[PDB]
Amino acid sequence: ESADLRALAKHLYDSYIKSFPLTKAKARAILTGKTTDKSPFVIYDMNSLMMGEDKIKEVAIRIFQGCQFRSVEAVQEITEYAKSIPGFVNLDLNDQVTLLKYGVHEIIYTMLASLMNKDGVLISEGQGFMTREFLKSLRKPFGDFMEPKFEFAVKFNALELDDSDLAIFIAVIILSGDRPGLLNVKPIEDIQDNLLQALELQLKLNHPESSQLFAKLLQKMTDLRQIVTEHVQLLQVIKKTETDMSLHPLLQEIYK
Numbered sequence: 001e002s003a004d005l006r007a008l009a010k011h012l013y014d015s016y017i018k019s020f021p022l023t024k025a026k027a028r029a030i031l032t033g034k035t036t037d038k039s040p041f042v043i044y045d046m047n048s049l050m051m052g053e054d055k056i057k058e059v060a061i062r063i064f065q066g067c068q069f070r071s072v073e074a075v076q077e078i079t080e081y082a083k084s085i086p087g088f089v090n091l092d093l094n095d096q097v098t099l100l101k102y103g104v105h106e107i108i109y110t111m112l113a114s115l116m117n118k119d120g121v122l123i124s125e126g127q128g129f130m131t132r133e134f135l136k137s138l139r140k141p142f143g144d145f146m147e148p149k150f151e152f153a154v155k156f157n158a159l160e161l162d163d164s165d166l167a168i169f170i171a172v173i174i175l176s177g178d179r180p181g182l183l184n185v186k187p188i189e190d191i192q193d194n195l196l197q198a199l200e201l202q203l204k205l206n207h208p209e210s211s212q213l214f215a216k217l218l219q220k221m222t223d224l225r226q227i228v229t230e231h232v233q234l235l236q237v238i239k240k241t242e243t244d245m246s247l248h249p250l251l252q253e254i255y256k
């Protein structure tokens with residue numbers, strides 16, 4: 001029954017809206033100028049950055065520490081969303097922890113695309129915007145840490161998914177039966193089979209005129225992995241270059 005599927009879809013959408021305070025729908029209204037009260041302050045160089053701090057320890061480290069604390073905040077939000085996915089909380093405790101460990105970054109990059117256009121990225125709950133060119137001009141190694149998230153986002157945003165599509169997608173990501181070290185793969189695969197079915201219906205109904213959207217979006221999951229791997233390689237370099245800079249405990253266990 002596709003009705004059971006549309007009900008799963010609506011439940012996931014509703015949890016997503018409750019769990020994440022900056023939706024894609026809000027992010028697009030900020031970025032495309034449906035605003036007199038929604039316009040961001042734009043940071044594109046060093047003075048506007050200082051100006052920024054006032055209207056909202058080198059600079060590359062500050063930005064990077066800022067990104068750290070925002071991923072941790074995202075993790076907490078993703079962790080709340082996951083508990084809402086039917087069956088997730090009934091899984092073995094170890095598998096819950098495994099699924100979140102490998103899933104949280106794929107989800108963060110997916111949702112990050114909603115805050116991006118080819119020119120920059122919304123920051124600080126949409127009150128700021130930081131240009132892609134300013135991010136790329138930071139001292140090495142930090143200079144090109146965001147470049148591949150931007151290249152991902154231009155491609156992924158061309159799919160034109162909205163929040164209700166993303167809610168099912170992100171659920172499909174967490175419920176991955178092939179994560180290393182999973183004790184009990186079958187209960188996961190059954191949850192994910194049901195999600196895949198919901199996603200397939202959602203995309204058919206929400207994008208009737210968009211041939212094979214479902215398959216194209218599943219192929220994107222490969223780009224996400226590639227983003228994670230590069231990013232882990234970049235973290236090993238930072239570890240050795242700055243012995244004074246501190247990864248956040250929550251993030252250190254994820255990566256461990």
Ligand SMILES: *[C@H](/C=C/CC(=O)CCCC(=O)O)C/C=C\C/C=C\C/C=C\C/C=C\CC
Nearest residue numbers: 063066067068069071121122123124130251
């Ligand atoms: C920050 C996003 C970085 C993503 C990463 O790859 C790093 C995450 C670490 C990890 O989980 O591996 C770039 C996006 C927006 C700008 C972020 C911060 C700019 C400065 C301030 C923003 C507002 C408040 C910061 C506390």
